[PDB]
Design a protein around this ligand. Sequence first.
Ligand SMILES: CC(C)(COP(=O)(O)OP(=O)(O)OC[C@H]1O[C@@H](n2cnc3c(N)ncnc32)[C@H](O)[C@@H]1OP(=O)(O)O)[C@@H](O)C(=O)NCCC(=O)NCCS
Ligand SMILES: CC(C)(COP(=O)(O)OP(=O)(O)OC[C@H]1O[C@@H](n2cnc3c(N)ncnc32)[C@H](O)[C@@H]1OP(=O)(O)O)[C@@H](O)C(=O)NCCC(=O)NCCS
Ligand SMILES: CC(C)(COP(=O)(O)OP(=O)(O)OC[C@H]1O[C@@H](n2cnc3c(N)ncnc32)[C@H](O)[C@@H]1OP(=O)(O)O)[C@@H](O)C(=O)NCCC(=O)NCCS
Ligand SMILES: CC(C)(COP(=O)(O)OP(=O)(O)OC[C@H]1O[C@@H](n2cnc3c(N)ncnc32)[C@H](O)[C@@H]1OP(=O)(O)O)[C@@H](O)C(=O)NCCC(=O)NCCS
Lengths: 396, 396, 396, 396
Amino acid sequence: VTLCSPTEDDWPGMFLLAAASFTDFIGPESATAWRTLVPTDGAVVVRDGSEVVGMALYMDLRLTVPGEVVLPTAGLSFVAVAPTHRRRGLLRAMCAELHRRIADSGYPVAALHASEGGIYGRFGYGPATTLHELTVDRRFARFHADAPGGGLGGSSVRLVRPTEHRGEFEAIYERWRQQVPGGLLRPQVLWDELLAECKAAPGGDRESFALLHPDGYALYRVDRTDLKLARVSELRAVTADAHCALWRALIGLDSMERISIITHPQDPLPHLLTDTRLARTTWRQDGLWLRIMNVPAALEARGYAHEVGEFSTVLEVSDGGRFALKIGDGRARCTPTDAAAEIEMDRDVLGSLYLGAHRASTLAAANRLRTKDSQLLRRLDAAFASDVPVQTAFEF
Amino acid sequence: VTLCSPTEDDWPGMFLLAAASFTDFIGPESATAWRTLVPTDGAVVVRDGSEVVGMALYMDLRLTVPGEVVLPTAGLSFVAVAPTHRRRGLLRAMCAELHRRIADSGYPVAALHASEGGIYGRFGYGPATTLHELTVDRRFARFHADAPGGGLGGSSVRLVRPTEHRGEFEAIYERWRQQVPGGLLRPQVLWDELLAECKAAPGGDRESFALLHPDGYALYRVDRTDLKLARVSELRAVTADAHCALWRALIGLDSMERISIITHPQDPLPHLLTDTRLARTTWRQDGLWLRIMNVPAALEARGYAHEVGEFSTVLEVSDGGRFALKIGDGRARCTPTDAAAEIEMDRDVLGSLYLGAHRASTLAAANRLRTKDSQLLRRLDAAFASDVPVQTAFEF
Amino acid sequence: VTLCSPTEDDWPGMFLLAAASFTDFIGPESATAWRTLVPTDGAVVVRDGSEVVGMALYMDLRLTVPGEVVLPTAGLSFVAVAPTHRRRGLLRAMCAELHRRIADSGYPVAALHASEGGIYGRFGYGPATTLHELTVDRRFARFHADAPGGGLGGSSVRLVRPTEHRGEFEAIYERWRQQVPGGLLRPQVLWDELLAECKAAPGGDRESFALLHPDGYALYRVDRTDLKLARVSELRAVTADAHCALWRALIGLDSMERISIITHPQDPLPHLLTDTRLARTTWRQDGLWLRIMNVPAALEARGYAHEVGEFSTVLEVSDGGRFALKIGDGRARCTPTDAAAEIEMDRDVLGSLYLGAHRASTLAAANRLRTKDSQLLRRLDAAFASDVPVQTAFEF
Amino acid sequence: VTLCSPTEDDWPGMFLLAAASFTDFIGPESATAWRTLVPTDGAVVVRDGSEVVGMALYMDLRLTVPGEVVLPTAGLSFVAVAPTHRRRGLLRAMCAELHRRIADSGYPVAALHASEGGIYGRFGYGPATTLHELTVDRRFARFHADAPGGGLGGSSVRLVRPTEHRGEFEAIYERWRQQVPGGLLRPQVLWDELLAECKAAPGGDRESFALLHPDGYALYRVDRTDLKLARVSELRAVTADAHCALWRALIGLDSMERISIITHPQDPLPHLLTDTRLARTTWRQDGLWLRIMNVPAALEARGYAHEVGEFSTVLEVSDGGRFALKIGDGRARCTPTDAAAEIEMDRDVLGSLYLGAHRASTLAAANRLRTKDSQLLRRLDAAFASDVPVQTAFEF
Ligand SMILES: CC(C)(COP(=O)(O)OP(=O)(O)OC[C@H]1O[C@@H](n2cnc3c(N)ncnc32)[C@H](O)[C@@H]1OP(=O)(O)O)[C@@H](O)C(=O)NCCC(=O)NCCS
Ligand SMILES: CC(C)(COP(=O)(O)OP(=O)(O)OC[C@H]1O[C@@H](n2cnc3c(N)ncnc32)[C@H](O)[C@@H]1OP(=O)(O)O)[C@@H](O)C(=O)NCCC(=O)NCCS
Ligand SMILES: CC(C)(COP(=O)(O)OP(=O)(O)OC[C@H]1O[C@@H](n2cnc3c(N)ncnc32)[C@H](O)[C@@H]1OP(=O)(O)O)[C@@H](O)C(=O)NCCC(=O)NCCS
Ligand SMILES: CC(C)(COP(=O)(O)OP(=O)(O)OC[C@H]1O[C@@H](n2cnc3c(N)ncnc32)[C@H](O)[C@@H]1OP(=O)(O)O)[C@@H](O)C(=O)NCCC(=O)NCCS
């Protein structure tokens, strides 16, 4: 068993492993497009002795974090070990090598979407965003008297074919992704792929439509089996006005009984309605997971809440160093120290804290972050909160 | 149609209306026990011309709010209008009269549990707690290396019959309710009623068991139809250690596939496990709803976050007054003013903010709270947050 | 194997057979009450050699037929053959004997409710009423501007406990049963039994309520398993105004999503609504079945439509005689003849025609009634129609 | 917002709206074929200011009504308003304009199939046919001794490929449509479309087969998901013999458990079987809806029942005129009058009465048709009945 970077001749064997490991496998043509985002030396394979029995890679991404700061981010993906070679340490070996390459290349953070919740904690990944599915019975939905844009006159929203309005979707998305933590840059090849998914499929998915506003859009399609359900695949709103107008239009889809969307826990949609209960939470799951590769670089890059007064502490990350951390005026300085730790946590826990999706106080109640100072805990909680709620961009 | 306080002769007609309006109607014997909590003049009925066609009442409660402050609280309940007399304004009339009585009696807040989400917003009630059902497939559940109490030696938890340990449940609950916002005092009659529900029912509910720790307890029973599901009706933990020990024991219920509980969004349970995803959010709903009866009294009673620096603003509640509000050092002072409002909201919105379950920033994105100052919004968000996560006590 | 009238010592063996043959077996106490309606010599049993292996009986009923005419009617019931003695001709033997007794006793018609649709056709029973279940999603239901009783002021309907209003239900029902074909007299013992079913059952059925109008009533209860479904067990309306008022009240049952009732195909309910489609036909089945025992007596007893001009024909019933039939001015005269038949049908077919539930033209298209004269067919169709739609009274 | 007839450049925008409004949208190629039936000026669009936000059209049809009379009929279809422009009166505007065009063009009636039951009543459309789904468990089905064509010798029915027998289907259908009320002429383009649906679809519908008799045919296919269900899409029988022979053959489909068909309430199928209950009514719904455009023209065109003696009345249609109506010898004469009305009804109600699907007595019990004369009501009921049961042709 050898571990190395794949040559062009390894890729058919990788695509086989992928087809056999991922039911949603996008196929060799789409995989070849995503492949443009994998840098030289961004992939590893394990060969038996010959054939590929393990693989893993990362893609070059740009991730927005609190304070509208954009970080270069290694997006781990296409990770698989053949059923014939599992529980033999191949994943451990591949992850160790890629993390070494990622850290040496100067990425401050790595990220992934997890096939199961039990795999990546041990490799230092913590779930950093939360997927929150809302399902609205639009037959009962009425907008609150307070909701923006209720009066007479035309709508600002147009029903359009997605493929005819690429330029506009690109520009709205680019605005959205820079202002929301969790935002990812979407390169040209991924827009190529996205807009190709919009067509009706040979007995597969039904046609996708779009609702377009100057400051937001929604892409949606009728569910394949539940013909009275419209599934919104993506709703990107730069303003509260755009968000409300788009929901007014979606709730106007008279042929549907239900509209669903995978969104974030702070989606204001329920508060737009006279009956908040009509926007039902029907599913909840971890979205993006984060591994902080360089503790000081990541902590100094992010913005912090201005409300909390300046404070100083000593943070130990379990195998990631001990640091004097000073947070004041929305900024952190994070320097080496051998002073006694006041806060201790595993690396995965820092990842969970990093985009504001999980409170330090909650992690502390589970003993995942240890301190004896309850005031310090309150201060950390407040500082690490994100003013702009964290959202999930696209799966990779 | 006359509206007045019921005489002893009206109660059989009220119990009829109740039986016909509430499928979960507790029955006349149990209703007669809850009745001990309804003060003189705490009930209204509407009679046709004669028979009761409408009813509503409130119970005297004690509710814990952020800062461990306990407020006298009017708990609205038993609200119904006969199917023969609906959409005729009887609810409006009954609510107007009870609110007048409640305000005059000196209650700063009223509260209820809503049969539907669309009814009470217009009467100034905002949803103030969130019910969050977690379901754990205990066959896969493993505790994290960090989780408290993993080593050898006896458990601190005992499997007991609930009815044999009333005194201990009472004392743990009394500790719990004083320290958690959302906490309600549970009078003797409600413990009488609770412990009577513990017995196996003639073809009804299965026997209830209890898991008892010095600092917490869990009451649970096997689901009537899904024999591999244990439903936890109530888990009251005063310490993180008690919470973890109780979950260790529940997850040890080898005969079960699944354990479910209706809990709060910040329950640390998922973080206790090696796979956070195993604690699945299977249902979400508004719990307790709040109507702030006296704006200055309520705002001055609550504690605020210490992290936010002192600030002053002018808050207008839509039909509830305009106030100079100064928040500093964890405390608010809230005085009459005719100065220009900086923040405006309907009364229901203040109720939603009051226990920290909903962020001002989220309500603002839906235009339910209006300000032009984004800094002020951040400050309000931080100040109104509850350090101790809000929980739901018992339904009434 | 002997066939005779049961002695008092046979009844425990009959009740055993019944318990084993009917899942809905009402039990020995209720069966003993219905037993008061069985005349002397109204029952037969077959004994092996000793124990009862077959039984059948009839009850003395009064049935309303078109023209508001009431006929003495033998209601066959409690018919069963032990699983150990089936397909041996016991049913044939028992039916032959009871029919002989029924005919000799002077009943012009016999009736039953069928456990399956394939049994009784061969014994001369035709399905004579149609059960039609309507289910209304009351959340969407709005009454048409034309529907009676929409304005302001009190309702004429009261929500009551059934057991406290026996006298009123009895009097309304007695009016209803005399004016509707399919109507049956309900003796005191059956009101005793009915009103005993109204109580909540030990883990069984939920409590029954009643909606009472001076000219109609509805009895209903929440479904045992679907807690948002109200099932109307019986709605007896003497006027269109009573029918509408009762439906207004039922549709006011705010706690329910759905209201269902087993009714007749001409129930005007759907036409009361702005969306007729909301009253969904969810089940359809034969109700009452009729065997005409004496052809001339039955045909002369009934009223016929006045619209059709006088006409004369010759009707042959397959093993039931040939008759000169003259119908004019709403009345028939039906005398023996050996003239050539113009219309031929089996006895069961006449039963199906008799209350107006099935058209002669429809039976003729299936060759169940044979004539060569299409004008005669049209005339028969018109004459046999019932001006008042046929309804189903109660099961026996 | 402008309302006018579409130009050739509007049609891509209409097809977009259609795709977004109708899940069953037949597609641009099929829509372009149906388009041949839309006359010049038969369509309207509403444009924002530019893009289509509303559309509606009618097709030129021929509808058979009682008495085998064929009426030119405007078939409304392709009606939609964009989700961004709803509840703004666009439907009202479009319907007003098309009705003006339809009335001026000299059509006595308009017709449609309704997406929901609550839309068209207000525009004067009443449901005029009833869809009645029967499902037969063919494993138990046995034909009655009376049913036509039971003896030995070959069947008159052949199992064929639909596309190889177009000429024969056309001729049988043309006979059927002229003799049944509800019948519609099926132009060549619709046979083109129909026979193209017969092929197996790329993962879609399974292959369609046909059963062919000289006087009738049935088209059917196995259900896509329930492989033991055969769904009959269309059964057109000119004789009772053809109807029975076709059902004998369908019930011979040994590979199937169930056969279903959407048929009419008077389908004689159940009476063909020894157990009528085996032909289960599994769904019921309004089919064709009618708006009578010219009251006197429509009432004089139809045939009436000969059985009812000559009578004269005065009928007021709510915004449709008042008429002296004389019906005798199967014919009506309907002339202007200002004499006092004896019968009053909204226009939609007349549409419901017109093909004999609904009884005047039933509409009257719901107060949808008002008279004080119960004899007059009986006479109207009898006169408006259709001797040949009304059927539904094809959806448009
Ligand atoms: C997940 C997967 C890559 C693991 O590969 P592997 O070579 O068998 O893993 P390793 O042998 O290196 O195991 C490393 C550790 O992770 C653990 N582990 C691996 N997969 C796990 C999972 N699904 N859940 C919980 N633990 C897991 C092992 O128990 C082991 O623990 P240990 O160090 O205490 O002994 C593999 O099962 C696979 O290809 N799955 C199918 C596709 C997939 O889901 N890939 C991941 C996409 S995000
Ligand atoms: C909810 C209930 C008490 C309402 O009584 P009512 O007398 O018909 O209400 P009113 O006539 O006074 O209506 C007042 C307003 O509330 C609205 N309203 C009442 N119930 C509502 C509901 N279920 N959802 C949304 N709006 C509702 C009315 O539309 C009306 O609005 P308007 O002021 O704009 O006209 C009644 O339907 C009932 O008894 N329900 C069954 C039992 C129940 O659920 N009770 C509540 C327990 S929390
Ligand atoms: C229905 C029941 C009474 C029949 O008794 P039985 O003694 O086996 O019937 P017989 O032997 O006299 O059969 C007489 C004819 O009826 C037919 N038959 C009996 N039950 C039938 C049924 N369920 N469906 C169709 N045909 C049936 C027999 O095939 C026979 O036909 P044949 O004359 O061509 O040979 C019996 O099966 C029974 O007790 N069922 C359970 C309870 C029940 O449903 N009772 C009827 C309440 S309405
Ligand atoms: C049905 C549809 C065409 C209505 O368009 P619209 O422009 O919003 O309707 P309007 O604004 O002109 O409303 C006219 C009236 O009809 C009512 N109405 C419209 N659709 C209705 C429906 N689905 N159910 C009940 N009432 C409806 C409105 O409430 C309004 O009533 P009012 O006069 O008392 O105010 C639209 O919702 C639509 O495109 N639906 C999707 C496709 C479809 O089903 N089309 C119909 C095919 S038969």
